[PDB]
Amino acid sequence: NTPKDQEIKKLVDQNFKPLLEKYDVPGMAVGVIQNNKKYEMYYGLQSVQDKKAVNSSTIFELGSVSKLFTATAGGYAKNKGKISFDDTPGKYWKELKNTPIDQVNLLQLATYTSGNLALQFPDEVKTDQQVLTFFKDWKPKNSIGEYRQYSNPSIGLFGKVVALSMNKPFDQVLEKTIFPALGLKHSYVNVPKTQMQNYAFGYNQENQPIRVNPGPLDAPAYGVKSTLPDMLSFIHANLNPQKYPADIQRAINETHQGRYQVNTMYQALGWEEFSYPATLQTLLDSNSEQIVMKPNKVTAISKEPSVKMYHKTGSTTGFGTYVVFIPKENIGLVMLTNKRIPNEERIKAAYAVLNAIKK
Ligand SMILES: *[B@-]1(*)O[C@H](CC(=O)O)c2ccccc21
After folding, report:
1. What sections of the sequence does the record tag as coiled-coil (predicted)?
2. 209 alpha carbon to ligand 1 midpoint, in Å?
């Protein structure tokens, strides 16, 4: 005898709200979408010093969840005939022609299998010229295509190439093409002055206010900021790609296509994919040190799961993000915080909520 909106709010209170005190997190937004109905829950402060409450207008940094938009942009360019995933980067960034990195194809860049690209660019690589020199100086290590090492430079280069193929800077690919196509009106690579009042402070581990700093190829790797309503709309788009024009529908579907496996994890384009129902440990394994921080040999997909789910975590210095959706259950969840919390806690809390919501 309790309305569903209250049932979902109670589940989020039971599973996400305690994380605020446990990790001293100033502000949090959690959203659930089920059967095209959205439920938004806001807690705490987007700015401690300004006593400004988290609300539907609050803009949060998505960290690596930005890679889902980069992947969507690549799927869009591929389906418009602007790139093939079998192309190499020198076809588009001409200064890379006939360098060793020009042996790596675009899908391998997007899915982290070049064989010699680390988590981050070197600290000293900052300017556009330094980024170019870094890729010109790149040499192979492991055999191309065989080992996954999650990597910002890898998918960053993919995003730069996607942008070159579309004749626009990457920030404009998202702000002028991809965000409008997905119906997102409060999502940004660069937050404009007229929206800075809505941009949350992030909070470091000392609870000091901070925001993300510029970095090499930051936009395609971790450059997006968004609101809870926009992220629910993005989940809706992933749950209902048939509701978009052909090129955008196909772009979304590209991001859902698993490309290879590492144990129980399927690497799609940006998204991680799993057979559903997934055990909690399967989902935790995807964020283990072994999977995130080390190279792992990839295997071809054997079981192509008809019933599946997708997720991605992201963090910046001052923010945490988790997004997850389950197509055949018509459900998804978004968590945004303005302080990092352990990825396992995000995954566990979402798992508990999603499994307990009545169908
Ligand atoms: B991008 O995605 C992962 C998210 C995570 O496991 O916390 C990541 C970690 C470190 C840098 C960049 C990313």
Report:
1. none
2. 21
Q: Is the CB of 198 under 6 A from ligand 1?
A: no
Experimental method: X-ray
CA–CA distance, 128 with 224 (Å, rounded to integer): 20
Sign of CA pseudo-dihedral 17, 20, 25, 26 = positive
Last-in-domain residue among 165, 199, 229? 165
Distance 6 CA to ligand 1 centre (A): 33
Q: Which residues span the domain enclosing 104? A: 73-165
State which ligand 1 atom lies nearest to the alpha carbon of 64.
Answer: 1
Resolution (A): 1.4
The C-alpha atoms of residue 329 and residue 12 are separated, in whole angstroms, by 18
330 and 289: one domain?
yes
Task: Give yes or no: residues 231 and 174 share one domain.
Answer: yes
Q: b vs e for 160-191, b when ≥16 Cβ sit within 10 Å of the residue's Cβ?
A: bbbbbbbeeebbebbbebbbebbebebbbbeb
Same domain membership, residue 107 and residue 50: no
Q: Do both 108 and 58 map to the same domain?
A: no
SS3 category, 50: coil
Catalytic residues: 64, 150
193 and 118, same domain (yes or no): no
Q: Rounded to an integer, what distance in angstroms lies between the CA atom of residue 85 and that of residue 158?
A: 10
Cβ proximity of 128 and 92 under 8 Å: no
Is 313's C-beta closer than 6 angstroms to any atom of ligand 1?
Answer: yes
Ligand 1, residue 313: give the atom nearest the CA. 4
- Run of H or E residues at 43: strand 37-47
Q: How many domains does the chain have?
A: 2
